[PDB]
């Protein structure tokens, strides 16, 4: 539920929360937690590889069964929990034998529901089954690229992927960015969309909310000095030059897809 | 590192020469590849990080002839 907060302090003026009563106000299921240390955008060399990352609140990793391998044994949804890691919400589930796991939350999913993965699974949001067993056109998410690898497609908070065509050992997938891609017809996928579809509706409001999420301030290019960046310098504001990376590479519209191993799977590029 | 284990081709240095003869230091790199080889004397495969030149050598001398040398050289394979 979206809530425009009230302008008490300037800094609350534009804060838009996403209120959900479904979020289990408790401590999460401890045997599926593990330490994820921060990095600050620094590799093993200790150089800042990717910029702008650092600080932020301490986060513990949740072990999400993307691979979704319990088959035949049905599940039942214990509760819906917040995830500090990813944008989408997760749900502690429970099988018949006793194992609890986390999965992602589809949009049409509440607590106490029962789901099941397999090949003989029914078709309701929350099942996961290989896409040769799925009707064409039905929107899914959590799509594996290789069979058994674990879903790497439509895994954010408000995504889904449609299955536009099945033919032979391949299925054509309309990606969320609108890019027709073949996938092998044995990859598994989870039916329906994914829960927090209104995650894009939030507004962070103040700059400290950016800093809570580990994102340092981004300095714009043309503020710098010419030694620092190609956009640098200028008596005042001068920008007589083409918009490029700090490493000189053209940015506005210059494509960068160099992977030619996988061109036979892209049916059509995005638009 | 980059060593054709059959021959011994090491990456040697040299120069890139402009048409105005401005020399800059460069390297020359051998065309090494990993490749399995059907050692029929044991009926199995041995991988060797080998240049394409040594592939002709195994095509000329035979693989057990070459493996005699690296046992004689003592280089593990």
């Amino acid at each position: 539920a979206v809530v425009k907060c009230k302008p008490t302090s300037p800094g609350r003026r534009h804060v838009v929360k996403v209120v959900n009563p479904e979020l289990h106000k408790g401590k999460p299921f401890a045997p599926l937690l593990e330490k994820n240390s921060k990095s600050g955008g620094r590799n093993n060399n200790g150089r800042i590889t990717t910029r702008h990352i650092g600080g932020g609140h301490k986060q513990a990793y949740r072990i999400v069964d993307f691979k979704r391998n319990k088959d035949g044994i049905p599940a039942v949804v214990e509760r819906l929990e917040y995830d500090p890691n990813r944008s989408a919400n997760i749900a502690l589930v429970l099988y018949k034998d006793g194992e609890r796991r986390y999965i992602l939350a589809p949009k049409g999913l509440k607590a106490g529901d029962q789901i099941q993965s397999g090949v003989d699974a029914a078709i309701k949001p929350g099942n996961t089954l290989p896409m040769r067993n799925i009707p064409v056109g039905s929107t899914v998410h959590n799509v594996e690229m290789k069979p058994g690898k674990g879903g790497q497609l439509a895994r954010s908070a408000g995504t889904y992927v449609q299955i536009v065509a099945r033919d032979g050992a391949y299925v054509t997938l309309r990606l969320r960015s609108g890019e027709m891609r073949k996938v092998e017809a044995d990859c598994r996928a989870t039916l329906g969309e994914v829960g927090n579809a209104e995650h894009m509706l939030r507004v962070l409001g103040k700059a400290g909310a950016a800093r809570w999420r580990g994102v340092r301030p981004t300095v714009r290019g043309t503020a710098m000095n010419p030694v620092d960046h190609p956009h640098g310098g200028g008596e005042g504001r001068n920008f007589g030059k083409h918009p490029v990376t700090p490493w000189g590479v053209q940015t506005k519209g210059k494509k960068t897809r160099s992977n030619k191993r996988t061109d036979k799977f892209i049916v059509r590029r995005r638009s | 590192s980059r060593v054709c284990q059959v021959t011994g081709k090491r990456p040697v240095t040299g120069n890139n020469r402009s048409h105005a003869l401005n020399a800059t230091k460069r390297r020359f790199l051998p065309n090494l590849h990993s490749h399995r080889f059907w050692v029929e004397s044991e009926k199995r495969f041995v991988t060797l990080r080998v240049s394409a030149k040594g592939m002709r050598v195994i095509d000329k001398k035979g693989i057990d002839t070459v493996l005699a040398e690296l046992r004689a050289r003592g280089e593990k394979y």
Binding site: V119 | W38, E40, F45, M55, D59, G62
Partner: protein, 149 residues
């Protein structure tokens, strides 16, 4: 790349043919599968005096086995139990080893590298043709019935 043939191979000739072929077809394929010997002078007269005549015998011990693996494999009523639905709707896809497992239980103790499928998946429950490659010449043809378990 001169090479002598340990067996008759289709697009280049019979046994005992010292043919120049390309390197990759010799090095990666014929030699490691043992279908040929590189025509070295130590192997020429090793072949031409001995294995030009030894392999004439050593091909007949396999060619006599060639008629066996289709003659006894003429029962053709191979039954595979597999879960499915209605008007087909198969649960689990029939694999090559699964066909190499029931025929293993009746007739040739057959390998996973013998099942040559024109179809592969075999979705619909019912009869399905299965070809065999027990030798490069003669093929065994068994139309296996898939049975809805």
């Amino acid at each position: 790349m001169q090479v002598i043939l340990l067996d008759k191979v289709a697009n280049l000739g019979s046994l005992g043919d010292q043919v120049n072929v390309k390197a990759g077809y010799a090095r990666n394929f014929l030699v490691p599968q043992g279908k040929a010997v590189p025509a070295t002078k130590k192997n020429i007269e090793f072949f031409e005096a001995r294995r030009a005549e030894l392999e004439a015998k050593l091909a007949e011990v396999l060619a006599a086995a060639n008629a066996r693996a289709e003659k006894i494999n003429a029962l053709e009523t191979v039954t595979i139990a597999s879960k499915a639905g209605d008007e087909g709707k198969l649960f689990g896809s029939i694999g090559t080893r699964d066909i190499a497992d029931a025929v293993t239980a009746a007739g040739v103790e057959v390998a996973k590298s013998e099942v040559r499928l024109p179809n592969g998946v075999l979705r619909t429950t019912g009869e399905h043709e299965v070809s065999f490659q027990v030798h490069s010449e003669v093929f065994a043809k068994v139309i296996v019935n898939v049975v809805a378990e």
